[PDB]
């Protein structure tokens, strides 16, 4: 009679939540972030021209 050896069950998952989220083509959060930062990045939202 031989004792059953100790076993360690490492965490395992084919699809983590990060890659499950990245599976979708477009993410609304990222798309909206880029589209709303577009104005700030490619234009001046503070300079005021009066003439």
């Amino acid at each position: 009679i031989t004792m059953l050896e100790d076993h360690e069950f490492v965490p395992l998952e084919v699809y983590t939540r990060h890659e499950i989220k990245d599976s979708g083509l477009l993410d609304y959060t990222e798309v909206q972030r880029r589209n709303q930062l577009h104005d700030l990045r490619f234009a001046d939202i503070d300079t005021v021209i009066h003439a």
């Binding site: 930062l37 490619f42 234009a43 001046d44 300079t47 009066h50």
Partner: protein, 102 residues
């Protein structure tokens, strides 16, 4: 992505102070020849955008002046922003003249 944010705004200049009446924001493509010659090689871009909206061919001149080639420059860095580029930082608006829809 090589596009020109063609935007046009109609502004009421009132008896005392200004007011908007519409901003037609649009994204316009650029010719293959423009990308090959001016964008990639010389690092510049034209002040005009020849493109087909609404089954019609249109061009818009930056600041409504004659054709010129602005020097393409990097965009100001914001939080979590990759490398972008834009020729103009401000946006042209009509000069104030009384009681005219400019």
């Amino acid at each position: 992505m090589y596009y020109k944010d063609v935007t046009v705004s109609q502004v009421w200049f009132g008896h005392r102070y200004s007011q908007f009446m519409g901003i037609f924001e649009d994204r316009a493509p650029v010719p293959f020849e423009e990308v090959i010659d001016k964008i990639n090689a010389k690092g510049v871009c034209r002040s005009t955008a020849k493109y087909v909206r609404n089954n019609l061919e249109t061009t818009a001149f930056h600041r409504d002046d004659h054709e010129t080639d602005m020097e393409l420059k990097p965009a100001n860095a914001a939080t979590r922003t990759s490398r972008g580029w834009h020729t103009t930082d401000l946006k042209y608006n009509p000069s104030r003249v009384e009681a005219f829809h400019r």
